[PDB]
């Protein structure tokens, strides 16, 4: 009665936003950046190798001081590493071994980890007793925790497998916002530089840009053919990039509302597990599933480097906040720090 | 070389490595069983026999420590978290034997045991369990012996040229389950015919997984 006319209205106004995106495409990124010079072969080298995990490494997060990191593996361990000296600063035994994400607070006081137990645990790194213990257990998702990021020492945005993102306050433990609107399992989120928006990617090939304070889906981005596994903001916050299982990265814009550039090579068949941007945004580092970690010229979409040092799937990666190095963790239980030489 | 605090930090990191390695060996002597099947096929019966995210059950038997992971409550997409169980010791796939003629409720046109063969085909030749042996439980056969005498097996099986007795029907069901195994060189299926009144199912999973453990230790020494 009303559902048929309502879905015809739905098709009508989403063709309206399709033609509105089509009205803005004056030119694409390729013939705009066809005049600028390429970056050359990005020759990077392994510097450290962080050994000590005894299962697959699922997530790493760089500290904001660009020296510490946290890594999560399914041997039940969250390891705080000093990346300069390869020292293990802390070893955190988790209650649930099935961890799929880890986060480092931007103050350095806390780490969050979440997995198949649907709980996002917050750990106090700097306590008076000397050890690390559980500050908070954010329970309230009904699917697996697939990502988590901190905004403060108090406000944390999570993605779950029950199609919802959430925004939690830690000192109460309750959700202050529930971001709903995805139809598939949400796999990744990426906070903006000013922490007022965040993009998210799910298994229905959708990247939803949310406003954190109003709690509403600002924009929705399509273009991929399968599950989007990782997402990352451009460093000025006016664009972002997704990596999906159809062997393709894409770069959408928050203002122009559409995809500008696609990162795909015919030699790659496998999925993409991680994407991250360099400090200038010129290089997009996508950790693929053919055991390599490719490095793309993010303005011209030609492949400029390969980081091939792992014996398994490059599962997580991350660039430091000062952009010195790139840590890739993989399913062969080995984190590797990378950068080039003059 | 290093400062005094750097050297005490390196000593702390060595203590971290020592506790990591001894915990990792204590965990490598663990039996991690992924529990799979359909809804109420005897899963609660076998989990009380062996004593909304994941449900892990830890127990011990004959000084061997078992952890068993039930992922039935996880209504998420299975193609995004099943590789977390790539590397379990065995998969306990549970199937009731009395569901060869009964029909599912959602479709009312497919057979229940045909749905069990579809699920066993999805679990057995999966790409993350090519090396994982599949313990196969076949449950409540004491009601199957009453259902096989009145109702024939030929409803489910067209190409059944066998008798309607108990042991021939059970052997035919077991061979039709074990013949979906498309990689029969790397894994092997261990089959058990159990009831509600038997005491020897945890003994079966102990013996079967002792076989899996000894074959794994043979493959890591070099004797395989």
């Amino acid at each position: 009665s009303e559902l048929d006319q309502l879905r015809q209205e739905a098709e009508q106004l989403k063709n309206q936003i399709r033609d509105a995106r089509k009205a803005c495409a004056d030119a694409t990124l390729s013939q705009i950046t066809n005049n600028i010079d390429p970056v050359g072969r990005i020759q990077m080298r392994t510097r450290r190798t962080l050994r000590g995990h005894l299962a697959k490494i699922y997530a790493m997060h760089w500290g904001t001081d660009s020296r510490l990191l946290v890594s999560a593996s399914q041997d039940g361990k969250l390891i705080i590493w000093d990346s300069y000296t390869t020292n293990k600063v802390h070893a955190i035994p988790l209650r649930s071994s099935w961890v799929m994400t880890c986060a480092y607070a931007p103050s350095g006081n806390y780490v969050a980890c979440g997995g198949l137990d649907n709980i996002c645990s917050i750990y106090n790194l700097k306590t008076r007793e000397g050890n690390v213990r559980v500050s908070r257990e954010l329970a309230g998702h009904t699917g697996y925790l697939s990502c988590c990021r901190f905004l403060d020492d108090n406000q944390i945005v999570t993605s779950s497998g029950d199609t919802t993102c959430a925004l939690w306050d830690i000192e109460t433990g309750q959700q202050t916002t529930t971001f709903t609107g995805h139809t598939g399992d949400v796999m990744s989120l990426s906070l903006a530089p000013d922490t007022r928006l965040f993009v998210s990617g799910a298994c229905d090939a959708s990247a939803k840009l949310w406003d954190v304070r109003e709690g509403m889906c600002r924009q929705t981005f399509t273009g991929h053919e399968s599950d989007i596994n990782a997402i990352c903001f451009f460093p000025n916050g006016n664009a972002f990039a997704t990596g999906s299982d159809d062997a393709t990265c894409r770069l959408f814009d928050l203002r122009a509302d559409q995809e500008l550039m696609t990162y795909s090579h015919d030699n790659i068949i496998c999925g993409i597990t991680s994407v991250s941007f360099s400090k200038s945004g010129r290089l997009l580092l996508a950790g693929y599933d053919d055991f390599n970690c490719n490095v793309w010229d993010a303005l011209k979409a030609d492949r400029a480097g390969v980081l091939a040092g792992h014996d398994n799937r490059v599962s997580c990666l991350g660039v430091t906040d000062d952009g010195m190095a790139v840590a890739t963790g993989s399913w062969d239980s080995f984190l590797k720090i990378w950068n080039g030489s003059s | 070389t290093l400062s005094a605090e750097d050297k005490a930090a390196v000593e702390r990191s060595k203590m971290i490595d020592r506790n990591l390695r001894e915990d990792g060996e204590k965990a490598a002597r663990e039996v991690k069983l992924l529990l799979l099947g359909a809804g109420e096929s005897g899963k609660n019966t076998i989990v009380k026999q062996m004593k909304t995210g994941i449900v892990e059950t830890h127990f011990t038997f004959k000084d061997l420590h078992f952890k068993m992971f039930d992922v039935g409550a996880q209504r998420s997409e299975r193609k995004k978290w099943i590789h977390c169980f790539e590397g379990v010791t065995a998969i306990i796939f549970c199937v009731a034997l009395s569901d060869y003629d009964l029909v599912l409720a959602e479709d009312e046109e497919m057979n229940r045991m045909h749905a069990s063969m579809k699920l066993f085909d999805s679990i057995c030749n999966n790409k993350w369990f090519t090396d994982t042996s599949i313990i196969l439980f076949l449950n409540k056969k004491d009601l199957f012996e009453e259902k096989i005498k009145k109702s024939p097996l030929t409803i489910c099986y067209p190409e059944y040229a066998g008798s309607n007795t108990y042991e021939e029907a059970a052997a035919y069901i077991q061979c039709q389950f074990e013949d979906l195994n498309k990689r029969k060189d790397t894994k092997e299926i261990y089959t058990h015919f159990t009831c509600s009144t038997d005491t020897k199912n945890v003994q079966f999973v102990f013996d079967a997984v002792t076989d899996v453990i000894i074959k794994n230790n043979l493959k890591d020494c070099g004797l395989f």
């Epitope: 510490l68 350095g108 000397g130 | 400062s3 060595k14």
Partner: single-chain antibody, 231 residues
């Protein structure tokens, strides 16, 4: 709360032996290296001994190397100093000191209440032994070292401590700049090379006491002679 209580001290004959116990409570005692630091009556502090986490490193002062034995009991949460050949110089007050070492750590952070025993290198230049002041004005306590504590190893291992009268010492600054936990932001630490300073602006009445600069660049650990703040 964190707590370290010491026992065993008292009157002994010279040349004898005595057991000093430091019972720990309220912190991960196995994760912390421990020190003994003593203070002779109306004198400064001198580091005595150091046992590491898991007893994998035991350092002594050459005054007591061979005569003292430091040993921790982690299941009982106790620290022990066995004292052999006690001369009349060893009349002091002993402090059992937690210290943990990783990146960004705060060593020497909680000192025990100490016990009194009565029986009958890099040098820190802390020459100004008394600075008289009234509350409300900024004071600058200076300290100099024999060699530099800063190079390409990265840090500058100078530790400012404060001892209020009738109390244990308390960490103010570690690694020359970083303020400790539980101390206000008016305390500042600065310096370069061999010359360092502690600034106490907006000074209140509870900053009366003796202030010590310590080095942690290499063993043995040496303090300053003290700098008294009074009135």
């Amino acid at each position: 709360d964190v707590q370290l209580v010491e026992s065993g001290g008292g009157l002994v004959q010279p040349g004898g032996s005595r057991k000093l116990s430091c019972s720990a409570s309220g912190f991960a005692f196995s994760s912390f290296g421990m020190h003994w630091v003593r203070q002779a009556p109306e004198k400064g502090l001198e580091w005595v001994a150091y046992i590491s986490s898991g007893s994998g490193t035991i350092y002594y002062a050459d005054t007591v190397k061979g005569r003292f034995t430091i040993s921790r009991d982690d299941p009982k949460n106790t620290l022990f100093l066995q004292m052999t050949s006690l001369r009349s110089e060893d009349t002091a007050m002993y402090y059992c000191v937690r210290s943990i070492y990783y990146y960004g750590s705060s060593p020497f952070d909680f000192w025990g209440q100490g016990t009194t025993l009565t029986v009958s290198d890099i040098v820190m230049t802390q020459a100004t032994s008394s600075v008289p002041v009234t509350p409300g004005e900024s004071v600058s306590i200076s300290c100099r070292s024999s060699k530099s504590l800063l190079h390409s190893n990265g840090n500058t291992y100078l530790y400012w401590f404060l001892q209020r009268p009738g109390q244990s010492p308390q960490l103010l600054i570690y690694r020359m700049s970083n303020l400790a936990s539980g101390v206000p932001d008016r305390f500042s630490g600065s310096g370069s090379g061999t010359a360092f300073t502690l600034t106490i602006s907006r000074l209140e009445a509870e900053d009366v006491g003796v202030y010590y600069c310590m080095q942690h660049l290499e063993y043995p650990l040496t303090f300053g002679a003290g700098t008294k703040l009074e009135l």
